[PDB]
Short mmCIF file of C-alpha atoms in Angstrom, two decimals:
data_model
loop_
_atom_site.label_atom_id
_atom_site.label_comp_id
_atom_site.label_asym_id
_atom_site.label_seq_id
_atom_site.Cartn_x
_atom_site.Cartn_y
_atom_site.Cartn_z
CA UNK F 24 0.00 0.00 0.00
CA UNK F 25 2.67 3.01 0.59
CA UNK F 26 3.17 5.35 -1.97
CA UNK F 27 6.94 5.01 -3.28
CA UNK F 28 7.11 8.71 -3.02
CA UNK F 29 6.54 8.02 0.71
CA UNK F 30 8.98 4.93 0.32
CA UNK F 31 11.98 7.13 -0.73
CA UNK F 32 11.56 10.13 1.99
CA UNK F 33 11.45 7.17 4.87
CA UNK F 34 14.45 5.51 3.81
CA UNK F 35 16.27 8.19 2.45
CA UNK F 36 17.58 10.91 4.96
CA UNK F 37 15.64 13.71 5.93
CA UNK F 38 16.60 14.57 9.85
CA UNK F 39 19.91 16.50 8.63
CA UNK F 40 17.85 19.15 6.62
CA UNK F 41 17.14 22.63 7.34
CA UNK F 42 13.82 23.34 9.54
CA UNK F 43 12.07 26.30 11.04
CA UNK F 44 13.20 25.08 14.35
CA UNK F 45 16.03 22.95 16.25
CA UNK F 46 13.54 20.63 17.69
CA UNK F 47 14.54 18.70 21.18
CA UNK F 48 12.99 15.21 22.72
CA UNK F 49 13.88 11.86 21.89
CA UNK F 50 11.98 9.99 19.22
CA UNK F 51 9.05 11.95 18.25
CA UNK F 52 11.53 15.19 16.79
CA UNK F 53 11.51 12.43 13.89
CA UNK F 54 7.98 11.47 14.62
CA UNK F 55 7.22 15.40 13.73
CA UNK F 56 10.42 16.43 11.24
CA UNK F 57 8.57 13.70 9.08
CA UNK F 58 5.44 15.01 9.39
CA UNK F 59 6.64 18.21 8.55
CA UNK F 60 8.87 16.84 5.51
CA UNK F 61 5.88 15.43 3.76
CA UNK F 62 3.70 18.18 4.29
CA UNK F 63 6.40 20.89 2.79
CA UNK F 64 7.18 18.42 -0.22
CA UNK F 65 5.02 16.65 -1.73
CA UNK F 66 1.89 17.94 0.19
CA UNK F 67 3.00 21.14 -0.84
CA UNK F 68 2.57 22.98 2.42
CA UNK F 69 -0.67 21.66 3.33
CA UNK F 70 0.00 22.29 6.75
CA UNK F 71 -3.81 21.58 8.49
CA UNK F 72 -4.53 18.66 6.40
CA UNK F 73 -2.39 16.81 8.93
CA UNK F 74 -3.35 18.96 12.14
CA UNK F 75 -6.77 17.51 11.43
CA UNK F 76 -5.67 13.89 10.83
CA UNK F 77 -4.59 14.43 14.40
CA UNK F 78 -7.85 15.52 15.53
CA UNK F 79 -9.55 12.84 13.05
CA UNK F 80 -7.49 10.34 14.94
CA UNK F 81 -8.63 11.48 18.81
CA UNK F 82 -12.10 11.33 17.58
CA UNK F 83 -11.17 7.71 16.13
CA UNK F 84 -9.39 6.76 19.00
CA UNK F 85 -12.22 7.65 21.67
CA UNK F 86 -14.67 5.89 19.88
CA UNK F 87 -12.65 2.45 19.84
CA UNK F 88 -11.00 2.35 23.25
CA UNK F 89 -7.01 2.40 23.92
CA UNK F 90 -6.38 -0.85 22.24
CA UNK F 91 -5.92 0.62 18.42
CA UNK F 92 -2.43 -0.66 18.10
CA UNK F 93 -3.16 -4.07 17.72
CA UNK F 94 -5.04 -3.56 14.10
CA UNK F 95 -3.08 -2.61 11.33
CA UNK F 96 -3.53 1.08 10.14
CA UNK F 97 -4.08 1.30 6.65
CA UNK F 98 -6.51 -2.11 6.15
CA UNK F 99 -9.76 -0.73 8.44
CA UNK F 100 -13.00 1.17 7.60
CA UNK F 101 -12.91 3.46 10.53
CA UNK F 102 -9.12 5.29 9.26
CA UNK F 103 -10.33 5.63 6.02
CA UNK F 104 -10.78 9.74 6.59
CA UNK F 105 -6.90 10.40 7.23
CA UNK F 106 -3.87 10.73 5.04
CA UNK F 107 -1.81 7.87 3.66
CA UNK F 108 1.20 9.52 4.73
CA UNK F 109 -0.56 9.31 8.51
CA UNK F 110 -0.98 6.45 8.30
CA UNK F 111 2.97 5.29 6.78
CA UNK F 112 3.95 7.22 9.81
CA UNK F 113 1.46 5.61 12.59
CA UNK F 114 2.98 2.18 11.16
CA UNK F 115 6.14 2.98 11.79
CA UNK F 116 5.59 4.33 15.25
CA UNK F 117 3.69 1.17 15.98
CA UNK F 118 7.10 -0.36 14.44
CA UNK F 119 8.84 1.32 17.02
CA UNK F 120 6.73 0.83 20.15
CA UNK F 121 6.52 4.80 20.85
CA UNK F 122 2.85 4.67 20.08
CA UNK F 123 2.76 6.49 23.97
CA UNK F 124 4.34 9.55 22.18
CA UNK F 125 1.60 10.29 20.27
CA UNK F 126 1.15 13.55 22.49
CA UNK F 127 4.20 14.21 22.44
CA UNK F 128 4.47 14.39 18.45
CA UNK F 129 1.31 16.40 17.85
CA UNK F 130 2.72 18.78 20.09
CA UNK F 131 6.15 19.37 17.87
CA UNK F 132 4.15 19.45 14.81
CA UNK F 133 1.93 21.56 16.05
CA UNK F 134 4.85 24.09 16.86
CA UNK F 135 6.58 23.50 13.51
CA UNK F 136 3.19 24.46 11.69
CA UNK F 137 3.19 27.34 13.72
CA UNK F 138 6.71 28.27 13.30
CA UNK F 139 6.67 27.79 9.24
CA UNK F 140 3.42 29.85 9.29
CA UNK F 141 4.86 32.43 11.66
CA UNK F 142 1.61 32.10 13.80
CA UNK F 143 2.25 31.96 17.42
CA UNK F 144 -1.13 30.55 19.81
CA UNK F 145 -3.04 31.64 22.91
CA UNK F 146 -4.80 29.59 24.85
CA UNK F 147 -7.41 31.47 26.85
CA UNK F 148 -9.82 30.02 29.82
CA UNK F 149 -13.09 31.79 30.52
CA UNK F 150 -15.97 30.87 32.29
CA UNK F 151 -18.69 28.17 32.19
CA UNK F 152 -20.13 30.42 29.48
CA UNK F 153 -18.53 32.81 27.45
CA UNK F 154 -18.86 36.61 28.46
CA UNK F 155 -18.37 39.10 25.83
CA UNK F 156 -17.46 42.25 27.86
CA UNK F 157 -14.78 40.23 29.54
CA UNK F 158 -13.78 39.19 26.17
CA UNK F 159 -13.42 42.04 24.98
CA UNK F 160 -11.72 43.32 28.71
CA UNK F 161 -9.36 40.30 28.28
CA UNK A 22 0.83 42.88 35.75
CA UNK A 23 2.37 39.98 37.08
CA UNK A 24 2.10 37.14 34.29
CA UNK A 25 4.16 33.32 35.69
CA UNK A 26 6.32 32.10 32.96
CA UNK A 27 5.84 28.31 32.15
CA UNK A 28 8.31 25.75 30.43
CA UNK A 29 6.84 22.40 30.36
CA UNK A 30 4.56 19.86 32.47
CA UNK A 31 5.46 17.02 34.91
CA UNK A 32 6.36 14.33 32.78
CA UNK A 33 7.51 11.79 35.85
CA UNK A 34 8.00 11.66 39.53
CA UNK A 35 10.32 9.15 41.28
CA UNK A 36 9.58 10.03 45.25
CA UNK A 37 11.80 12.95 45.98
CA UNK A 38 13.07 14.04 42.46
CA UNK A 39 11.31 14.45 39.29
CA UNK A 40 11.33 15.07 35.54
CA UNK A 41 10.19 17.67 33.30
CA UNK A 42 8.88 17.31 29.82
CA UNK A 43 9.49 20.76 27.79
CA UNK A 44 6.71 22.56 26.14
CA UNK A 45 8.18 24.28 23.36
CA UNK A 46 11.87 24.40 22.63
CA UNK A 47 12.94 27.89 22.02
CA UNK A 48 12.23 28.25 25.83
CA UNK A 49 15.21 27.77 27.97
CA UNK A 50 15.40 27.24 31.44
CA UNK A 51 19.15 28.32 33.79
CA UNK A 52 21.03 26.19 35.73
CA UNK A 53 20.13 25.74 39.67
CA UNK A 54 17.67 28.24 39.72
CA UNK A 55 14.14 27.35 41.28
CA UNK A 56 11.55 26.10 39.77
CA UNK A 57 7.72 26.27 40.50
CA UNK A 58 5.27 23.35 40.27
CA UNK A 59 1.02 24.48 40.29
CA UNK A 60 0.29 21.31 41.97
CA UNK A 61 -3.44 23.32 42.61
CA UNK A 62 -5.01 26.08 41.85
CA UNK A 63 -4.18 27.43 45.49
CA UNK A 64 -0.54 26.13 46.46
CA UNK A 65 2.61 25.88 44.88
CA UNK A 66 5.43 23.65 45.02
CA UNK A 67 9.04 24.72 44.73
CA UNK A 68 11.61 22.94 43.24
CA UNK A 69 15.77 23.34 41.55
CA UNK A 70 16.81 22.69 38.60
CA UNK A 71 20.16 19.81 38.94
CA UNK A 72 20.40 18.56 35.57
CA UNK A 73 19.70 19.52 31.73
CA UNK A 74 19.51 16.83 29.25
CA UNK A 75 19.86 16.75 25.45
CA UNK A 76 16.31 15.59 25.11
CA UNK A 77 15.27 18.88 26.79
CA UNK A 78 13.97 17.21 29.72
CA UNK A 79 14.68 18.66 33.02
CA UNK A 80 16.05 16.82 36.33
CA UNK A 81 14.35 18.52 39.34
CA UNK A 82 14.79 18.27 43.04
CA UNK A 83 11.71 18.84 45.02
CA UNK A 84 11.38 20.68 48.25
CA UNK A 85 7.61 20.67 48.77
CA UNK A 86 4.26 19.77 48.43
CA UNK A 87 5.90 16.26 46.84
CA UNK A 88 2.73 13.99 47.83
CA UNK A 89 0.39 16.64 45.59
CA UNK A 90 2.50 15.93 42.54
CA UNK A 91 0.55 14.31 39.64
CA UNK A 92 1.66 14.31 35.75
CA UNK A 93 0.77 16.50 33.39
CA UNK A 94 0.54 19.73 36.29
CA UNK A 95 1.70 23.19 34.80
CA UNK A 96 5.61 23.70 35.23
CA UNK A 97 6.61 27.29 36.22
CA UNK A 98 9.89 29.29 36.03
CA UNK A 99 11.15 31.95 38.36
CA UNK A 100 14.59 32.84 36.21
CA UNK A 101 16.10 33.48 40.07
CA UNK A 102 18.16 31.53 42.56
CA UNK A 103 17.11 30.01 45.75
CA UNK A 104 17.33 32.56 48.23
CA UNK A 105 15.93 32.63 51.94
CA UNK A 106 14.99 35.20 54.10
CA UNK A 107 17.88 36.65 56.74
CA UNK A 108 18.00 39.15 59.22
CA UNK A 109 18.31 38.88 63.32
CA UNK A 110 14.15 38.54 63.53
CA UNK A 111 14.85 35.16 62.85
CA UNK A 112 17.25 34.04 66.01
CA UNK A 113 15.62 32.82 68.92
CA UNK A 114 13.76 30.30 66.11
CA UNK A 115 13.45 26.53 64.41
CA UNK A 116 12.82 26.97 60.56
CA UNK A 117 12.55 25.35 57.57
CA UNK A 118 15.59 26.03 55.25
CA UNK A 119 12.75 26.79 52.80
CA UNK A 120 12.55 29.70 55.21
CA UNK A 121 9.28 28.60 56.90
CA UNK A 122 8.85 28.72 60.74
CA UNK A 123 8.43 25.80 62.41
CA UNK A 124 6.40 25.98 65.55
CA UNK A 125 6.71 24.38 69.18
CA UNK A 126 5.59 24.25 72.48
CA UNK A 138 12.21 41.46 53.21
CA UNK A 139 15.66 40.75 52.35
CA UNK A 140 16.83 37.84 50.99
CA UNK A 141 19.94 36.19 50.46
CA UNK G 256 48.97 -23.28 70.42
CA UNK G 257 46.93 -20.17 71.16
CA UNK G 258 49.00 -18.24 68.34
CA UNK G 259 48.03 -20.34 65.46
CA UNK G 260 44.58 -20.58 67.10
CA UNK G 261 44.40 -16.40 66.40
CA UNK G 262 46.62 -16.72 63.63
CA UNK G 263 44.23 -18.99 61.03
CA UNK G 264 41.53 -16.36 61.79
CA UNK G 265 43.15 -13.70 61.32
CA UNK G 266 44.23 -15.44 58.10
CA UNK G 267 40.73 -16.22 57.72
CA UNK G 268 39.12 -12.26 58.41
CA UNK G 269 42.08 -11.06 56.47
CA UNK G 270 41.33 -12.82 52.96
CA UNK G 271 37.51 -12.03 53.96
CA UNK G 272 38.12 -8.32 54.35
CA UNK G 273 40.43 -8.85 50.95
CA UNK G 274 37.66 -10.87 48.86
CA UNK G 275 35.19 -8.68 49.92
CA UNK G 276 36.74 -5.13 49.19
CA UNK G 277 37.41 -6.43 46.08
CA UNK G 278 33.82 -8.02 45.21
CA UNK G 279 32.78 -4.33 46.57
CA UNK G 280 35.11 -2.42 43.91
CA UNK G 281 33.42 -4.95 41.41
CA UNK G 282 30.18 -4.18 41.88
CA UNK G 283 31.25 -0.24 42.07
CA UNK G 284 32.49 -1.13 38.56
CA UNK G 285 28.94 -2.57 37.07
CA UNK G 286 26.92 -0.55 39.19
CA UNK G 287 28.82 2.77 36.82
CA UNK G 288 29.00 0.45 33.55
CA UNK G 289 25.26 0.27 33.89
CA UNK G 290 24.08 3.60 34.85
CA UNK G 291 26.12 4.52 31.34
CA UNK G 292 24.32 1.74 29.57
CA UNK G 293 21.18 3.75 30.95
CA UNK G 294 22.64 6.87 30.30
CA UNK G 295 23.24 5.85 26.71
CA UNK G 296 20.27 5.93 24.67
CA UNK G 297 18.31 3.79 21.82
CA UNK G 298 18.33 4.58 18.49
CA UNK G 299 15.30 4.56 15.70
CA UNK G 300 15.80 1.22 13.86
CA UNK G 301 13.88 2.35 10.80
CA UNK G 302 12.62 0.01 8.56
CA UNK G 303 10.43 -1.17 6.04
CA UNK G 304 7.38 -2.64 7.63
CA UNK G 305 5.00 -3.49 4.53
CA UNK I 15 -19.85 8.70 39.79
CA UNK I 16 -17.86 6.32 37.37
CA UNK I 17 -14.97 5.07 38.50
CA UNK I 18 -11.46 5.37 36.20
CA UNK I 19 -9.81 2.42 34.40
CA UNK I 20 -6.84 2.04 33.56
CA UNK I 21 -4.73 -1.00 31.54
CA UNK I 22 -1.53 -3.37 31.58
CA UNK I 23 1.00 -2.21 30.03
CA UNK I 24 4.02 -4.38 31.24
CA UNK I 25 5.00 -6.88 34.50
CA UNK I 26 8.43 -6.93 35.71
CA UNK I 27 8.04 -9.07 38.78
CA UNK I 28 5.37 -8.01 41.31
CA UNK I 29 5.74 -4.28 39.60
CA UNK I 30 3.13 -3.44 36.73
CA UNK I 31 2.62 -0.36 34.56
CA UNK I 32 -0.70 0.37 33.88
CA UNK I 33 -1.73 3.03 31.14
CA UNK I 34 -4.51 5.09 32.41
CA UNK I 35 -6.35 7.37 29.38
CA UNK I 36 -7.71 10.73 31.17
CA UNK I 37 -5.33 10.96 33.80
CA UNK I 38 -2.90 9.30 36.34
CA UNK I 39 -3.97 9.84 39.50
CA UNK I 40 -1.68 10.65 42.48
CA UNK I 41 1.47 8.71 44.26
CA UNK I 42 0.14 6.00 46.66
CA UNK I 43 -3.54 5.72 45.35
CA UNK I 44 -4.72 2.10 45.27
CA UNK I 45 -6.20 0.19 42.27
CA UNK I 46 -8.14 -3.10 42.41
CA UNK I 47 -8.37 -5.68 39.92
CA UNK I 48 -11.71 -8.00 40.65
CA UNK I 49 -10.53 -11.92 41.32
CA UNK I 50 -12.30 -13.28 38.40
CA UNK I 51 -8.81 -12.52 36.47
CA UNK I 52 -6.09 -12.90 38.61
CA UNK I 53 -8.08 -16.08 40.40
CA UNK I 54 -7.45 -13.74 43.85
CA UNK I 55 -8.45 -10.02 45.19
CA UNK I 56 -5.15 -7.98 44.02
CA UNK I 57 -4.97 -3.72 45.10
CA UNK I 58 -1.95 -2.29 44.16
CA UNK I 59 -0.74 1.11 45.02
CA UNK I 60 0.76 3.66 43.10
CA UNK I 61 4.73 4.55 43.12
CA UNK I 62 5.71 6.48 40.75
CA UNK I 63 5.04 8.14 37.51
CA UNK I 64 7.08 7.17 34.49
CA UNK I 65 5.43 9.45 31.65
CA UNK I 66 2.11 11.07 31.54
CA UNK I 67 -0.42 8.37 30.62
CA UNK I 68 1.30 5.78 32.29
CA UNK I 69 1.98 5.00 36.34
CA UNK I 70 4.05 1.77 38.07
CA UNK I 71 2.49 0.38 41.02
CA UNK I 72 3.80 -2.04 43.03
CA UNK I 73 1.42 -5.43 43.73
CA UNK I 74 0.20 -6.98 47.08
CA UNK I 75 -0.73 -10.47 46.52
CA UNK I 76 0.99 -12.31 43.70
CA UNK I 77 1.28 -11.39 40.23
CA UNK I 78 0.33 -15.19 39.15
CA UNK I 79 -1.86 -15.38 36.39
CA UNK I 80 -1.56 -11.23 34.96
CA UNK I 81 -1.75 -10.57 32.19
CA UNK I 82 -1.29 -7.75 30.00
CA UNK I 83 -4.57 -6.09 28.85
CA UNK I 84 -6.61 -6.75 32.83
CA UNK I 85 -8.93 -3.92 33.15
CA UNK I 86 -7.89 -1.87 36.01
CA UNK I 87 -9.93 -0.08 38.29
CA UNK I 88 -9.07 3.26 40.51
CA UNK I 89 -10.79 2.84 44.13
CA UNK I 90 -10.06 7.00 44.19
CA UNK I 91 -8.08 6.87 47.84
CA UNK I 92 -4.69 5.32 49.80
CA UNK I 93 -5.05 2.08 51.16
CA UNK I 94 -7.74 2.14 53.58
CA UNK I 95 -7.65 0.17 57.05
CA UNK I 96 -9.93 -0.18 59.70
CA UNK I 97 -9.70 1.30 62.87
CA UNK I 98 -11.63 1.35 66.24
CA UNK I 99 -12.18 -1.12 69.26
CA UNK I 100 -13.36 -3.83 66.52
CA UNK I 101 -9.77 -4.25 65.73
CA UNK I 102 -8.81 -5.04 68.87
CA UNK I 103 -7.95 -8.94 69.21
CA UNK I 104 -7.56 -9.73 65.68
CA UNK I 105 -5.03 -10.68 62.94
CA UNK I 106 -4.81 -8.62 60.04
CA UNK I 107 -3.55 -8.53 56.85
CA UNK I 108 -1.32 -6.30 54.57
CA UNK I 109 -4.46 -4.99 53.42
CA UNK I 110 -6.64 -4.96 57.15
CA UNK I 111 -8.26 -8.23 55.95
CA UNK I 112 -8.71 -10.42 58.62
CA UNK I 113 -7.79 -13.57 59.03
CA UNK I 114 -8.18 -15.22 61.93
CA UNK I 115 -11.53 -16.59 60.50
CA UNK I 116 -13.46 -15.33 63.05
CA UNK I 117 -16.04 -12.96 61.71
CA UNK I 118 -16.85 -9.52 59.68
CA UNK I 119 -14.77 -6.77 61.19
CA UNK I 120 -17.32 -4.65 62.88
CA UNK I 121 -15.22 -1.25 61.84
CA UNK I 122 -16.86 2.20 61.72
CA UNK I 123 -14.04 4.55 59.82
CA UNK I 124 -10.81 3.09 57.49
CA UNK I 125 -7.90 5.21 58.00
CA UNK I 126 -5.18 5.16 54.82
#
């Protein structure tokens, strides 16, 4: 099923080229530079495409319980909304066990989006029900 | 006025140390300066920075409040040393080396 | 009589003292070899899957 | 209200990680596993926290029979003992159980 486009960027090199960012952690910096790498190349900077496979996937996820590793990403009815290129790179993280990162990658390539954009987020916390005076206050 | 700068959440907790998880990376946190930890919306927990790792992760050393720790609490940054209050109010007195008093029966250095 | 009666044992607690500081200094040894195997980290082991 | 759940991850020994999806609760909360698994009542307390998502906890009775996907379930609280003048010549457990085989524990209040 993957795409030899998709083929060539995995097992080629792609970690030693120039980003937006120097990006620290352990795994998932590759987990994200990927992410980013296919979404600059041959996405052609469809940035939110993947930013809503991620959200795609919690919806996913929630519905089917924590046990989603065991079956196989591509092959299943319910992962049928989200990108191949998602789902090359949630097969290799389930080749690699760091399937507990998953957090931890939406996180970098949320920043790396943000960074090639140039759009910097605010996360504000009012109420239990919006106010628009203190909106606009705030 | 007074906005509290954060740099990551609690990513683990091994009894009286702990580790931080980063947020984003172009933040950067000094070297044995204190830490904060919001372990509620009313107290705080203070903490020092030991060790810096090439994953950005943090190695802390906690002081209090360790038993309120969970993971995933908002990590906070004071940029500042750990200092203590001084002065001769404080002799004729038990007392934390956090500087609290200890009962019985402004300037820092 | 009596001096080779404290003589073997202090033969005896002598190469005790010996084996143990060194079994000590060997387990000093591994105890650092493996906090730098921990200290070390894994790498990606990329591959194809499919 | 609902109690959390939480699931296997890995057993080394009597310690387990368990991988809980909201949110880990605190050091030294205990979490039951009902004895239709395990063949036996097992509560196991919390340790320490590895990542977020995941917590090791240590085990109380013996980690025969785990296995790796056992449905986990946070009581919310320490481990609770009795407490009182009901306690007061009896045998007790690790976990306050009696058993001397006398009777029900006539307790009032569990302290952690």
């Amino acid at each position: 099923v993957p795409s030899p486009k998709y083929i060539e960027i995995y097992q080629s090199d792609f970690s030693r080229n120039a980003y937006p960012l120097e990006l620290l952690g352990g795994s998932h910096v590759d987990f994200a530079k990927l992410l980013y790498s296919f979404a600059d190349q041959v996405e052609n900077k469809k940035f939110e495409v993947y930013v809503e496979d991620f959200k795609k996937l919690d919806s996913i996820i929630a519905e089917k319980g924590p046990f989603w590793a065991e079956e196989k990403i591509f092959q299943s009815p319910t992962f049928q909304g989200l990108s191949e290129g998602f789902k090359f790179i949630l097969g290799w993280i389930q080749s690699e066990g760091a399937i507990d990162r998953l957090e931890n990658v939406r996180l970098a390539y949320k920043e790396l989006v943000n960074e090639a954009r140039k759009e910097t987020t605010a996360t504000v916390i009012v109420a239990k029900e919006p106010s628009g005076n203190d909106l606009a206050e705030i | 006025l007074e906005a509290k700068q954060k740099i990551g959440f609690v990513h683990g907790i091994d009894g009286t140390i702990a580790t931080i998880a980063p947020a984003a990376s172009k933040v950067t946190v000094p070297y044995n300066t204190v830490l904060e930890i919001a372990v509620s919306a009313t107290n705080i927990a203070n903490a020092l920075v030991f060790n810096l790792e090439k994953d950005g992760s943090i190695g802390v050393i906690l002081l209090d409040n360790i038993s309120e720790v969970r993971s995933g609490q908002d990590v906070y940054a004071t940029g500042s040393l750990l200092k203590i209050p001084v002065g001769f109010h404080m002799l004729g007195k038990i007392i934390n080396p956090l500087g609290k008093e200890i009962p019985t029966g402004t300037k820092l250095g | 009589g009596n001096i080779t009666g404290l003589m073997q044992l202090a033969d005896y607690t002598y190469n005790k003292t010996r084996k143990e500081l060194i079994t000590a200094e060997l387990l000093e040894i591994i105890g650092t070899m493996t906090a730098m195997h921990a200290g070390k980290k894994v790498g990606l082991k990329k591959t194809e899957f499919w | 209200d609902v109690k959390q759940v939480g699931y296997v991850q890995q057993i080394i020994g009597a310690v387990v990680d368990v991988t809980f999806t909201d949110s880990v609760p605190p050091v030294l909360t205990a979490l039951t596993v009902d004895a239709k698994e395990t063949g036996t009542l097992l509560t196991m307390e919390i340790v320490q926290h590895l990542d977020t998502k995941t917590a090791r906890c240590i085990c109380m009775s013996s980690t025969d029979m785990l296995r790796l996907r056992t449905p986990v379930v946070n009581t919310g609280s320490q481990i609770t003992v009795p407490v009182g003048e009901a306690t007061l010549g009896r045998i007790f457990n690790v976990m306050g159980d009696a058993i001397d085989q006398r009777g029900p524990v006539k307790n009032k209040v569990r302290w952690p």
